[PDB]
Design a protein around this ligand. Sequence first.
Ligand SMILES: NC(=O)c1ccc[n+]([C@@H]2O[C@H](COP(=O)([O-])OP(=O)(O)OC[C@H]3O[C@@H](n4cnc5c(N)ncnc54)[C@H](OP(=O)(O)O)[C@@H]3O)[C@@H](O)[C@H]2O)c1
Lengths: 49, 1003, 96, 97, 97, 145
Amino acid sequence: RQQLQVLARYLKMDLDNGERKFLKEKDTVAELQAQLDYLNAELGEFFVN
Amino acid sequence: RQQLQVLARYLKMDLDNGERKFLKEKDTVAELQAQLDYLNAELGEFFVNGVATSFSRKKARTFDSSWNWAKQSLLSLYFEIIHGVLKNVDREVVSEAINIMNRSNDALIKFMEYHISNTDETKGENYQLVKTLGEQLIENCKQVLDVDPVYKDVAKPTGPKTAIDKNGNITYSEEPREKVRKLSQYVQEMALGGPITKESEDALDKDSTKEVASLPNKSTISKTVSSTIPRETIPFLHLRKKTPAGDWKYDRQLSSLFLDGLEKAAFNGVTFKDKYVLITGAGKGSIGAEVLQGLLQGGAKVVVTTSRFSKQVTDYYQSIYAKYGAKGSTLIVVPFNQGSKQDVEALIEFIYDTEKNGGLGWDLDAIIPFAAIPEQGIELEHIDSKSEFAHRIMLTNILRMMGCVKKQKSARGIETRPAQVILPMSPNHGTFGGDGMYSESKLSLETLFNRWHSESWANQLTVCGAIIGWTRGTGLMSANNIIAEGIEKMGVRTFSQKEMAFNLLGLLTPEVVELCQKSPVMADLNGGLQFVPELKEFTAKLRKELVETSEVRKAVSIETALEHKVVNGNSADAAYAQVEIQPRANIQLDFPELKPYKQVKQIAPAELEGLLDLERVIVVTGFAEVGPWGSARTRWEMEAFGEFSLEGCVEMAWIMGFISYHNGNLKGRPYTGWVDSKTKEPVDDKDVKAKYETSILEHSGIRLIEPELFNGYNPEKKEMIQEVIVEEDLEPFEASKETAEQFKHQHGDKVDIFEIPETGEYSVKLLKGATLYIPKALRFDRLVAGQIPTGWNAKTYGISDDIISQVDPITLFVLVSVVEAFIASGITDPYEMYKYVHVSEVGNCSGSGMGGVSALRGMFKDRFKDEPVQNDILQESFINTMSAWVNMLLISSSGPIKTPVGACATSVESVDIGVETILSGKARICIVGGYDDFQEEGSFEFGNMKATSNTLEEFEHGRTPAEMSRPATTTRNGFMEAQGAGIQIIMQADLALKMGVPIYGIV
Amino acid sequence: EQGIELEHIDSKSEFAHRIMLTNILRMMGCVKKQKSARGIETRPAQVILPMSPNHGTFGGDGMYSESKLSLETLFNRWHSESWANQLTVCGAIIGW
Amino acid sequence: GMFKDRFKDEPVQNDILQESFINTMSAWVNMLLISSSGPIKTPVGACATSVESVDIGVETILSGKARICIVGGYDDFQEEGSFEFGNMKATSNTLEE
Amino acid sequence: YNPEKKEMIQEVIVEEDLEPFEASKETAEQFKHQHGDKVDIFEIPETGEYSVKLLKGATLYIPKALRFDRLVAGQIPTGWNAKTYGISDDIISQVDP
Amino acid sequence: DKNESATINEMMKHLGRSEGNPVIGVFQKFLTGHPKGAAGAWMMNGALQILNSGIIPGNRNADNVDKILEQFEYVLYPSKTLKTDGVRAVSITSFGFGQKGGQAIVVHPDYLYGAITEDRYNEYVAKVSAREKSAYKFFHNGMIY
Ligand SMILES: NC(=O)c1ccc[n+]([C@@H]2O[C@H](COP(=O)([O-])OP(=O)(O)OC[C@H]3O[C@@H](n4cnc5c(N)ncnc54)[C@H](OP(=O)(O)O)[C@@H]3O)[C@@H](O)[C@H]2O)c1
């Protein structure tokens, strides 16, 4: 693991770049899902569908 | 890359796992965003944004302290009469009498008796007036001590009056009606109707004291106004009865009940004691606002909603409660969006929930759902998001609100306390046009008259349909005020909000309440408007006849002026034109006013002359401060008046560094005056307010902590450090030999240091097991403080950069306060004291609770982080160092120096020490007062002690920074920390008289 | 909308009211906009409005009665607005 | 406690600030022993605090505000003040001694 | 307190990423709030703890020791204890010495 | 706020303050906040400004007075400024941490002038008038430079 880290650093590879992007999008999903949930609570399923 | 791949495979590390998860979530985002986009395309932005919740239980503001407001109202009336602001001809006297009688209790009567009995009627006519009025108001309050409070409006009825001046400006004014000078005559006028509605003694305005004497007397009505309704005339206000055919027609008997109630209300007032009311749409200028005022005057318990919950709105309702809230009344103000189904349900749950569960524990008697938004210029083809949203507010969510009340009552088995729903119906069913779905909203409410019979909610709700006539001044109708005089020429009636409110309050009288419990009530409050044929065209013609006359007069007057100008030239109008004087700020020191000896001799007893040892009388000769509102002058304007004069604005703009003075050439021309400190553009005094007042008010007083004032302190990001044991050796770093040896001394075997022979620097290698500190940030919940105005700078006062760099900031507040206190004493050179006293006889007894806390930070924290800190930081921390600097920079006394530390009571301890120092003969003049600073560490600790208000809890309660400090209030929850200094100059009175310094007070 | 009294008015009734009122006004509006965009002032579309004698008489029909009664505004709006040349109003009060 | 221990997220009692105040020692005296409702005038006078105390106590008694007065002074030695008195060169340098 | 070994801290910019260390979610979020892009924190799904990974350019503080030259003081006699006089442990724990 | 009301109320009751004559409370900290050691000094400055103006500032944040305070019949809690026809004396009370209670009473300065003769008073009036003019001179020069 330490050898892989040293090589990652030589190569200027951000190993966590993808898990970092993932957690930003997971927050965007929860923000959009809250907006949708709110509109469902205001209009109801029958209306929204 | 190939070696990294081989190791990734040995380790069973999926390197692409994160980019793979990311692309799955990016697809989930686009799917959710498409659903949201679709709902926006279907409902529109106006609607989607419009249905946002506003309601929260914690934002509910409760007003119930009518016991206190009654005494305030009495004292205000008392002083308004004494000062001649209210005369014996003003109706305000009678209206205030009614509101005081409505709050009559034993304490109020003792209060009035003391104030009125101790009034010296010989001091002037106004004193005799207040004494006579007050004696009558006492007699009234004794008679109504055990009587229910009444809604009773005595305001002059106002008609519409449109005026076009010579130059074609249109003035709309509410003008007193000639025939109708009381509500009793208004009711008579309503009863008689007009020719268009024909099918086939009092002391008001002359002796308010006499009118007040009449107020408790229940006037007997021999013959009712209903008996005067002509045969074959429909009153302007009437009730309708549903015919067997299913048409609603004028009913003389029901109409007689309503109009007799209005007549009794107008003479005797009506009580709403023990009515619980929800009212929506009661903002300033609304009908609802006037309905609210009457309900509170009659002792109702009211929930009022607002879609614009703010400090300005809560202060509006507070002022309404304090003026009109009768004994037993309560006003609850809640944020609310009637366009939100969630708000509707939450509001009603709140009202009905037990106090234990955080509700009001109420059961509604009346619902007045007047929330509306204007739809203007929206014809059929424009009906879109806004109109759908408006229709949700004005129809759908009214049905849902009624439904919610029905469900709450039925869940609790309440079958014998129905809520009267006063429905705001309209004669406008698509007659005007351009109002979106307004007409559809209003006409749809008419189904409730039939649904009351056909469904299962009649025992929980009653239906009272008010067909509301042309009411001037409201959010919906203000755009139509200019033509109302013309409409009335047809023998038809338009209404003030006061009159309409009075009409609607007539529906809540016990007789109409009982009528709606038998069957739905339809009340026509339309002022005969329905008998005007082709109304829209009639209103468009009155509008054109007015706008055409305005625009023609404007054009003809402009051309007649230009013709005169051409024929007579500039010399004709140069001598006619006239010079305007704009005020300049003339800041005054506000020395006390000295009366002629004869006047001053009358206040003290005659025996006082020669009785006192004036060496033992201590006076204040000067005072100053530096605080969140500037100086003592600016803080007083804000405290006493709530706003700055021109002098206050200019002082604040100068204090805050917005303006600077300039004397010399400025862009060629010679200029003497204020300039903008940044741009160096001239600023006239008259423009300081428009240019800077908003900035002054935003950056003064109690406000969010500004990090730039507190060395970058940010309560949202408080810097701490966490000790961590290094698990693996760190990458070596370079340090000087000196520093490397200090690392080695600390860590011993957990560090290796090695000379780098080339450079003479050292490598430092922290090893496994070594202790490190890693910065971490904490969110702290005290975000607000009383801060000295942003831009305050000791250099503005004259303090040199050498002093500023040496002393703790607290010391600068003191130095400024002291010089300003001396100026307020008229001592501009402190050495003048030494013409009168020995250098041993000028003392400093001022102190601090905590002293130079920025210097403490220096020595406890900055020094520990090896930051640059002046070598004599310790001395600048001491509580007595501020007084030392005062003596060292300004006073040069050899007098007493007694520095108290008394936490929050330091300034009073200071005065006690100063007084005793002067009475002991040790000093003749003493600098007294107190000072303290605001900094991170003390704020944190006052928060850990829970002494200060938690800002996040305040924000949950909808409080803004300006309302977080609310002493003696029900919901007070901790102090608001501030900073600054205050100083007085005290001396022996004998010396103050000999020096000729101003005397502000005797200690 | 069956068995939907006042206290039950919810999603379905709001949606039904959109179908039976709001989107009828929008449909009329759309036809007005199309005709006006093309300068058609002499070929009005007759709107046969399905009106009802049921204005809350039976109960339990959600916002039905509100939808039907609200259509009656069109009789006045035809005179008060600017769409009379594009649309005519024919209110049919439909019996049992 | 409040300037350094709190910054290092060390355990510090929540009411540490009150125990710092120069007048808290007199408050504890009153709270634990005396229970008076008499004058409380806490001087701060650096090295002359105890004489300022006596002057205040004397004047408090001569003014008629008290008949008995607890006078005196107190101070502690700790790292930080020792360091700063050294930076001001007020204290003797032990290595020179 | 040992004047011969006075504890200070020196701010150092991390030149290379540190070995990750474990912290609670709460603490990890306080590190993230402070350092922003100069730290990475990741839930460890098994335990619910967080890895904290300080990156190149992050600010650390490294303890260092200074020899101070005031080594002597007038100290209350070694073994003085307020309990000898009768003062309870509750008072001792509450008040400044 | 409860302890302070109760204390003022008990002082007034013990000294036979007239029933119906509450002291009018001023609560300057609604506007300024609490500056710890400066608190009394700002209040004293206020008190002096009240005495010389007759204007009693109201607590504009007094939305609803705590019902617990109704028992204190000798206190009145205004929400708005009252322009009186004169204030003769003001009480300033302070309560610090560590049982630091304080009270100061300030009396209207015009009660001093009954202690002296007309000639002394007129000499003083002239001196103060001259000093005030010199102070305005000093103040405006200082402010602008
Ligand atoms: N001539 C007339 O004026 C007339 C005639 C016939 C019927 N009416 C009816 O009488 C009622 C009141 O009329 P008005 O002229 O007094 O209306 P208005 O002055 O426009 O007042 C309506 C109030 O509703 C509040 N409001 C706005 N949007 C809201 C929301 N989303 N949720 C909660 N409240 C909201 C606003 O007060 P806040 O800003 O405090 O939120 C607004 O001031 C209406 O239903 C109207 O149709 C009026």
